[PDB]
Amino acid sequence: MLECTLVADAASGQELYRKGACDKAFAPMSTFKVPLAVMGYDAGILVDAHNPRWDYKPEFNGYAFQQKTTDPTIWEKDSIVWYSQQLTRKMGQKRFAAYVAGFGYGNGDISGEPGKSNGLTHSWLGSSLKISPEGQVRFVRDLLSAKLPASKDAQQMTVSILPHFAAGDWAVQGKTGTGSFIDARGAKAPLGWFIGWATHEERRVVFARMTAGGAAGAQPAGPAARDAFLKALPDLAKAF
Numbered sequence: 001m002l003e004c005t006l007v008a009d010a011a012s013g014q015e016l017y018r019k020g021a022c023d024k025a026f027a028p029m030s031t032f033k034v035p036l037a038v039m040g041y042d043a044g045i046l047v048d049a050h051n052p053r054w055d056y057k058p059e060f061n062g063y064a065f066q067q068k069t070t071d072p073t074i075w076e077k078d079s080i081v082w083y084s085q086q087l088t089r090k091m092g093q094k095r096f097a098a099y100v101a102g103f104g105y106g107n108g109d110i111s112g113e114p115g116k117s118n119g120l121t122h123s124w125l126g127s128s129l130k131i132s133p134e135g136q137v138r139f140v141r142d143l144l145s146a147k148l149p150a151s152k153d154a155q156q157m158t159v160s161i162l163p164h165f166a167a168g169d170w171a172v173q174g175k176t177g178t179g180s181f182i183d184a185r186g187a188k189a190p191l192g193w194f195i196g197w198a199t200h201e202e203r204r205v206v207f208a209r210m211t212a213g214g215a216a217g218a219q220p221a222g223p224a225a226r227d228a229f230l231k232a233l234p235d236l237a238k239a240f
Contacts, residue, residue, distance in 0.1 A: 001211060001212060001213035001214050002020070002021055002024070002210075002211070002212040002213050003019070003020045003021075003209075003210070003211050003212075004018075004019070004020040004021055004022040004133045004208065004209065004210045004211075005017065005018070005019045005020065005022075005207070005208075005209050005229065005232065005236075006018050006022045006133045006134065006136075006137055006207065006208050006209075007205050007206070007207045007236060008137050008141065008205065008206050008207075009203065009204070009205060009206075010141060010144050010197055010204035010205055010206045011203075011204060013141060016205060016236075016239075016240055017236050017239065017240075022132065022133040022134055022208070022210070023132050023133075023134055024132055024212075025106055025107060025130035025131050025132040025135065026130055026131070026132075026181065026191055026210065026212055027124065027125070027126040027127065027129060027130060027177075027179050027181065027191060028106065028124050028129060028130075028131045028136075028177060028193070029124065029125065029126065029177030029178055029179035029191060029193060029222070030079045030081070030175065030176055030177045030178065030179075030193070030222060031131075031136065031175050031176070031177035031193045031195050032084070032124035032129070032177075033075065033076055033079065033084055033175055034139070034140070034143070034158065034162065034175050034195070035099070035100075035103055035105055035139065036084055036087060036088070037072065037076065037157070037158040037161060038099075038103075038143065038148055038150050038154050038155055038158045039087075039091060039095070039096065039099045039150070040072075040087050040091070040154075041150075041151070041153065041154035041155075041157045041158060042099070042150035042151050042154035043091050043095060045087060045090050045091055046072050046087070046157070048072070048157065049071070049072055049073050049157075049160060049161055050071045050072065050073060051071060051072070052071070052072075053069060053070070053071045054069065054070055054071075054083060054086060055069050056068060056069065056070070056082065060082040060085070060086065061082070062080070062081060062082035063081060063082075065078075066078065066079075066080045066081060066082060068080075070082075070083045072161050073161055075161075076161050076162055076163055076175060077163045079175075079176060079178075079222070081125070084121075084124075085121040088120050088121055089120065089121065092120075093119075093120050096110070096120055097110060099150070100129075102148075102149040102150075103139065103148060103149070105129075105131060105135070105139060106129055106130050106131030106132070106135050107128075107129065107130045107131070108129075109123070109128040109129055109130065110123040110128060110129060111123065111127075111128040112127050112128050113127050113128075125179065126179040126180060126181060126191070133195075133208035133209075133210045134208075136193075136195045136208040136210075137195075137206050137207070137208050140195060140196065140197060140206045140208075141206050143155055143158065143159065144159065144197060144204070144206065159173070162174060162175055162196060163175075165226070165230055166230075167198070167230040167231070167233040167234055168233070168234035168237075169200050169201075169234070170198045170199065170200045170233055170234065170237065171198065171199045171200070172196060172197070172198045172199075172230065172233070173196050173197055173198075174194055174195055174196020174197070174207075174226070175193075175194070175195055175196060176192075176193060176194050176220075176222030176223055176225065176226050177191070177192065177193030177194075177195075177222045178190075178191070178192060178193075178220040178221045178222035178223070179191040179221075180216075181212070183213055183214065187214075188216075189212065189213045189214050189215075190211070190212075190213070190214075190215070190216045190217070190221040191210075191211070191212050191221055192209075192210065192211040192212075192220070192221025192222050192224055192225040193208070193209070193210050193211075193221075193222055193225055194207075194208075194209045194222065194225040194226040194228075194229050195207065195208045195209075198233060200237070203240060205240075207229065207233075209225045209226075209228060209229040210225065211224070211225050211228075
């Protein structure tokens with residue numbers, strides 16, 4: 001459908017590969033757990049790879065498979081939405097809004113759902129906040145270079161906690177996003193992300209794969225984008 005693969009060199013910033021429409025902004029969904037980690041570590045609310053450890057509570061109202069005890073590592077690996085929301089509740093509106101503005105993240109619109117005043121906990125979840133694959137790559141390069149307006153330690157910690165994958169000789173880390181949007185004909189259309197970086201020999205690349213439209217598959221769009229990108233990477237790498 002609408003599909004983007006964008007790959008740049010992490011060190012030099014040079015664009016290495018592009019396919020599809022990569023300049024259209026969509027809801028970041030769970031890819032927003034990457035900047036949230038930076039925020040959480042900088043704020044001192046998140047401590048390390050395994051702390052704090054939070055139990056699920058029914059008032060959090062989380063997804064059935066995500067109703068389990070979570071730490072920062074499990075949060076990123078299993079994409080635990082309620083953990084994000086507990087984090088933003090604790091950091092508060094002032095700090096959240098300061099971080100999003102400081103990061104220059106996508107459209108910077110954290111208003112949330114039109115008539116709900118829920119931006120603090122819902123803005124990245126298929127409502128107000130939008131970012132393009134270009135913006136994602138820009139953000140991730142900044143993260144790896146420790147150039148975000150947050151402590152160096154917070155950015156290094158964030159880098160360390162994203163889940164690991166392998167694609168041939170490439171060692172990969174990255175974060176999925178799965179959501180939906182109402183398309184031009186009023187239909188609920190799937191949205192998928194996989195963003196992160198990959199390392200091989202002297203090279204490190206930063207990447208974003210995004211899919212948008214049209215029919216929901218059995219596999220969530222995020223993991224599907226993840227599998228597709230990992231499958232493609234060794235071939236793409238031949239032309240680096």
